[PDB]
Structure 1
Amino acid sequence: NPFQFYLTRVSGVKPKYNSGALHIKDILSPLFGTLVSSAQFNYCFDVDWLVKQYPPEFRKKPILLVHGDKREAKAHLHAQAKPYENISLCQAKLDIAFGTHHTKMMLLLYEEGLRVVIHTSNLIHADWHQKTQGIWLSPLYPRIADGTHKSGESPTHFKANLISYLTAYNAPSLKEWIDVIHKHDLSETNVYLIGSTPGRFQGSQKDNWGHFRLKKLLKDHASSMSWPVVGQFSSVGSLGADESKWLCSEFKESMLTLGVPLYLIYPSVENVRTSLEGYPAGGSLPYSIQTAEKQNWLHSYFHKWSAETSGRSNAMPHIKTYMRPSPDFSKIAWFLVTSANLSKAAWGALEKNGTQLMIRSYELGVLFLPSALGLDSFKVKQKFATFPVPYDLPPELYGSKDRPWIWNIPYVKAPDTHGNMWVPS
């Protein structure tokens, strides 16, 4: 299995749909390595829950929480963490308004080596219970021989790219992690790192982050041959008065680069209502009416969540993925799993006559390119060489009575899976 792409365990589906799936407890298990230290990058944290996910033998090893919380939220997290002597915090600078530290990553230092986990879940119980989430698991990276001269770099430049991603935080606790990474051999890595960090980026720096980073990698490492672009996310930013301000102009331009139909997959109200969680799934799909009403044009692109292939049509998506399938959806030019939702905040927007890329947030994903395996395309695994696309293809268009889930309006005409309504207030 060259991909090491996994879905999270979902409670309440037939065990067969969990056979290849991982829970955070599986990831932190002693079978994965003898744990020495770890760093947990994320957005939302439940500290008490998090510590319980570690096996008892490792619960006392040092843990760094890398978050972007400010003011009261920051003190609240510090409070959550106070009781546990072994936990430190690193607040990621967020100098631009409306930015978040949204990246989900685990750095796991073991006696036997190092593991990097890049994924889509918050460190709270409900993100790992009944949601469709994605995980990339790196191989066990060995420590570089105490007396040898090697970069420990991969053909994909993962080691250096990860270091540059961490370097951008300018944070003392991350420098130690940077030092740990320097000391390991990451050469077996076959994926590309695509990061976002807060900044306004000029000249050659534009290629470093966000959608320009992706455009850059697709230009250098993909080959060109009508192939659609598929985008799949759980949050939607304000994209502009029409499709030509950002979505189809700079954003799609990056995505269609190689060496045109746009499908956007986003849960409808019906998807959420009939889900395993019901309407409360909607708490993690924060599309607000203020944003939606500004951009009714967008919803023509929306397609339903459907994941029969993985038994997860009722497990609402918190994963985010982008890909480039062939016209019959049987193969793909590339696949990306990332924390980046469909927002300018996450991906970048061009400013100052198009000489500046403005990103608001930290995001991180892994791009799977066939060339990194010495292929030209991946065949799509039709039943979750062959890439495990986690939802059904082709995607299904919203019906005429369908609506995009909007989290801050009420739904009171029809009860959900648990006989409940939704009245946010």
Structure 2
Amino acid sequence: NPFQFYLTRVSGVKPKYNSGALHIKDILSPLFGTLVSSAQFNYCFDVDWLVKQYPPEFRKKPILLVHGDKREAKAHLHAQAKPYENISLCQAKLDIAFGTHHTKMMLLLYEEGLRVVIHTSNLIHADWHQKTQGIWLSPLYPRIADGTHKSGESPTHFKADLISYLMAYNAPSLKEWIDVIHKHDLSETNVYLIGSTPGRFQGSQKDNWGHFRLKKLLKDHASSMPNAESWPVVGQFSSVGSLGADESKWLCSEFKESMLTLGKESSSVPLYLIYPSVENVRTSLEGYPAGGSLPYSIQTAEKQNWLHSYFHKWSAETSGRSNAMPHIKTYMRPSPDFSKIAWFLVTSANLSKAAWGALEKNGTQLMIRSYELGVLFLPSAFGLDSFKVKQKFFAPMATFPVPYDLPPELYGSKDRPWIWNIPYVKAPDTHGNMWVP
């Protein structure tokens, strides 16, 4: 397969549903490269657990933890890392209120080259245990020979775009990694980078990040087809922000408008949002504790009940993962019969203005609060007009492995979105327990 899109291993499904899945220990294995040093970008870290995931022979190599924690949370992270003298930390600046460092990425420098891993899992045991999570594995990028002047750039501009993403941190530890990336050949990369970084972007910079970055790539590198108004948009996420009092405030006015872009020319497009119901969580492998990783607060939800009419259940028979709650985030543009897709994005970005950006100043500036990162699969980058949808996730190679079932199934009238901070004491979970926050 050209796509190198993987799911994490799920403990408790039959082996056929883990054939071709990856655990973190597989990613860090010596079979992937002889590790010299690494950078782990993430939100949440269990450092003791993380070090145990590296092969014993590599556990003393330098590790950089890139995080967004402040104040007492920052002190707790430093205390976790203090026993390991090979671990350094980089605090990503979050100068806009209510932002988060969400990006999940590994930079893996080897004796043999460099690898980039963009994924969806926090660096804690539970995120790799019984959840549906996504991973993109870059090729092994070789080093450019000393004295050789070449760009090492791909047709998708991934090298310059990754360097631009890292430059936004303005961090000395990341300038070191920028210099590493400069020295490697990333030309084989077939995905486009879609990042978010905190700021207020206008003019030339408006298209660099968030939903305007997606819109720009779709304008420039996808083509519109006849009956494009009938091709739905699907968004699938683990958390929901405050979107406003009605769908015209943001969801259907700027977010959907960016997602429905195709090609360079001048809406009734269906919008499917996939988010676990209470029943999905209750009957999951983890039970109600899975909802600890589905942060949707009652304070947010009660202001936007209009949104829940867009919600569809989590179902993943195709990958044996209907009971493995999603922490992956994906967005895509299927055909009206869901047999093809015009593009697919795996990302850290949830359904929130903080992650994707919100227009300000009479539509002239895009304001983003958080760091996010994902990779976009466009048919044109593979010499194709569209991707066929792979019927069975683990079963030509030009078919794209969509990890959940299509078409998405609407919530039933008795279903409710998972809301993490209210009790569920009416039916017990798969471990015999209720949920009492």
Match of 1:320 among 308, 329, 336: 329
Q: Once the two structures are superposed, what CA deviation does each residue of 1:43-84 show, in whole Å capped at 9, x if it has no partner?
A: 000000000000000000000000000000000000000000
Give the distance between the partners of 1:387 and 1:36, measured in 2 at CA: 33
Counterpart of 2:44? 44
- Return the offset for 1:352: 1.1
- Residue 153 of structure 2 aligns to a residue whose secondary structure is coil
Give the distance between the partners of 2:87 and 2:145, measured in 1 at CA: 30
Q: Once the two structures are superposed, what CA deviation does each residue of 1:363-419 show, in whole Å capped at 9, x if it has no partner?
A: 000000000011010000011910000000000000000000000000001100000
Give the distance between the partners of 2:31 and 2:398, measured in 1 at CA: 27
After TM superposition, the score normalised by the length of structure 2 is 0.97
Give the distance between the partners of 2:334 and 2:314, measured in 1 at CA: 17
Q: Once the two structures are superposed, what CA deviation does each residue of 1:86-107 show, in whole Å capped at 9, x if it has no partner?
A: 0000000000111000000000
Give the distance between the partners of 2:57 and 2:208, measured in 1 at CA: 40
- Return the offset for 1:168: 0.2
Give the distance between the partners of 1:244 and 1:204, measured in 2 at CA: 26
Q: Does residue 1:414 correspond to 2:418, yes or no?
A: no
- Return the offset for 1:122: 0.2
Give the distance between the partners of 1:256 and 1:326, measured in 2 at CA: 12
Give the distance between the partners of 1:245 and 1:102, measured in 2 at CA: 24
Q: Does residue 1:235 correspond to 2:239, yes or no?
A: yes
Counterpart of 2:77? 77
Give the distance between the partners of 2:421 and 2:344, measured in 1 at CA: 32
Give the distance between the partners of 2:56 and 2:75, measured in 1 at CA: 27
Which segments of structure 1 move beyond 4 Å, counting only runs of 4 or more?
none
Bigger drift between 380-389 and 400-409 goes to 380-389
Give the distance between the partners of 2:408 and 2:144, measured in 1 at CA: 45
- Return the offset for 1:295: 0.1
Give the distance between the partners of 2:112 and 2:194, measured in 1 at CA: 27
Give the distance between the partners of 1:141 and 1:281, measured in 2 at CA: 36
- Residue 83 of structure 2 aligns to a residue whose secondary structure is coil
The aligned length equals 424
Give the distance between the partners of 2:307 and 2:136, measured in 1 at CA: 30
Give the distance between the partners of 2:297 and 2:238, measured in 1 at CA: 12
Give the distance between the partners of 1:93 and 1:100, measured in 2 at CA: 10
- Residue 242 of structure 1 aligns to a residue whose secondary structure is coil
- Return the offset for 1:145: 1.5
- Return the offset for 1:320: 0.1
- Return the offset for 1:280: 0.2
- Residue 252 of structure 2 aligns to a residue whose secondary structure is helix
Q: Once the two structures are superposed, what CA deviation does each residue of 1:26-45 show, in whole Å capped at 9, x if it has no partner?
A: 00000000000000000000
- Residue 6 of structure 2 aligns to a residue whose secondary structure is strand
Q: Once the two structures are superposed, what CA deviation does each residue of 1:226-267 show, in whole Å capped at 9, x if it has no partner?
A: 100000000000000000000000000000000000000000
- Return the offset for 1:148: 1.2
Bigger drift between 141-150 and 109-118 goes to 141-150
- Residue 333 of structure 1 aligns to a residue whose secondary structure is strand
Give the distance between the partners of 1:199 and 1:339, measured in 2 at CA: 18
- Residue 231 of structure 1 aligns to a residue whose secondary structure is strand
- Residue 362 of structure 2 aligns to a residue whose secondary structure is helix
- Identity of aligned pairs, percent? 99
Give the distance between the partners of 2:149 and 2:121, measured in 1 at CA: 37
Pairwise mapping of residues 92-241 of structure 1 onto structure 2 (< 5 A)? 92-225=92-225, 226-241=230-245
- Residue 12 of structure 1 aligns to a residue whose secondary structure is coil
Q: Does residue 1:279 correspond to 2:282, yes or no?
A: no
Give the distance between the partners of 1:379 and 1:108, measured in 2 at CA: 32
Counterpart of 2:353? 344
- Residue 287 of structure 1 aligns to a residue whose secondary structure is coil
- Return the offset for 1:204: 1.9
Over aligned residues, Cα RMSD in angstroms?
0.7
Counterpart of 1:389? 402
Q: Once the two structures are superposed, what CA deviation does each residue of 1:163-211 show, in whole Å capped at 9, x if it has no partner?
A: 0000000000000000000000000000000000000111121100000
Q: Once the two structures are superposed, what CA deviation does each residue of 1:137-184 show, in whole Å capped at 9, x if it has no partner?
A: 000000001231100000000000000000000000000000000000
After TM superposition, the score normalised by the length of structure 1 is 0.99
Give the distance between the partners of 1:285 and 1:206, measured in 2 at CA: 30
Bigger drift between 349-358 and 159-168 goes to 349-358
Give the distance between the partners of 1:163 and 1:352, measured in 2 at CA: 29
- Return the offset for 1:296: 0.1
Counterpart of 1:403? 416
Give the distance between the partners of 1:212 and 1:242, measured in 2 at CA: 21
Give the distance between the partners of 1:61 and 1:314, measured in 2 at CA: 37
Match of 1:360 among 357, 361, 369: 369
Give the distance between the partners of 1:217 and 1:147, measured in 2 at CA: 34
- Residue 302 of structure 2 aligns to a residue whose secondary structure is helix
Q: Once the two structures are superposed, what CA deviation does each residue of 1:102-140 show, in whole Å capped at 9, x if it has no partner?
A: 000000000000000000000000000000000000000
Give the distance between the partners of 1:401 and 1:57, measured in 2 at CA: 53
Give the distance between the partners of 2:66 and 2:181, measured in 1 at CA: 17
Q: Once the two structures are superposed, what CA deviation does each residue of 1:335-385 show, in whole Å capped at 9, x if it has no partner?
A: 000000000000000011111100000000000000001101000001191
- Residue 37 of structure 1 aligns to a residue whose secondary structure is strand
- Residue 353 of structure 1 aligns to a residue whose secondary structure is coil
Match of 1:305 among 302, 314, 321: 314
